[PDB]
């Protein structure tokens, strides 16, 4: 059984997609719950949240034997992770954020539009950033 | 110009879904760069990982006016997030993780599909919790 190819390999990719927005969903409602004083819940979301930090890892783990969810390429030493996340940082101000800016303007909804032009402005500041690191990195 | 419907709606879906996936990934990174020594890295890894955490709840407060991505229902107080934690841990523990680990084992992957039936008795853990804190609420 070889993982790269499986119905398995989807559902890891699926799982870890699910597991990283539950944390961060969680996190968002612990802030809610914070504001309006229900301390108690708010430290249970904080709790969930850090399971679904365990489960996360757990699937990305699984997935270092075919490579990184978001692009594709081999993970795990920092200078993979480097060029990984280098790539997918550049796909993001290349292509996504910028053509998710022009759909809102083109249905629109301007602040949206200007927001996900904002996001594409950060990700370039991570991508070089990220470069730059690389460029560094003795190892 | 309505939210509900739109290509920039699932736009936001799926930002939030990729800006999830980033903080998690780019803390697996940071634990790796902790190993190697590789210290300023995992710093940087951090860093840019906040600013994943600040444009996911920004997609996700677009979202607000739509529903929770997980699971169509609305969300802002802590009564409505408990709810749709509950409903998405519901489908988590009875559908979803069963579903994948069957999958797994059909496919040869013991120990993968072990480990998404320890999720699945995980999620029920996490779905109950929420309903006993749900039923303790006082808003
Ligand atoms: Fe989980
Ligand atoms: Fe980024
Ligand atoms: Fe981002
Ligand atoms: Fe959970």
Do not use: C
């Amino acid at each position: 059984a070889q993982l790269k190819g499986s119905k398995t390999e989807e559902n890891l990719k699926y799982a870890f997609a699910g597991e990283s927005q539950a944390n961060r969903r969680y996190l968002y409602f612990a802030s809610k719950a914070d504001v309006e004083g229900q301390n108690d819940i708010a430290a249970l979301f904080r709790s969930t949240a850090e399971g679904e930090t365990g489960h996360a890892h757990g699937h990305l783990e699984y997935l270092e034997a075919v490579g990184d969810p978001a692009t594709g390429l081999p993970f795990g030493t920092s200078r993979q992770n480097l060029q990984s996340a280098i790539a997918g940082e550049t796909h993001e101000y290349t292509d996504m954020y910028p053509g998710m800016a022009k759909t809102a303007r083109d249905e629109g909804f301007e602040e949206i539009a200007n927001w996900f032009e904002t996001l594409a402005k950060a990700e370039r500041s991570h991508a070089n950033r990220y470069t730059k690191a690389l460029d560094g990195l003795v190892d």
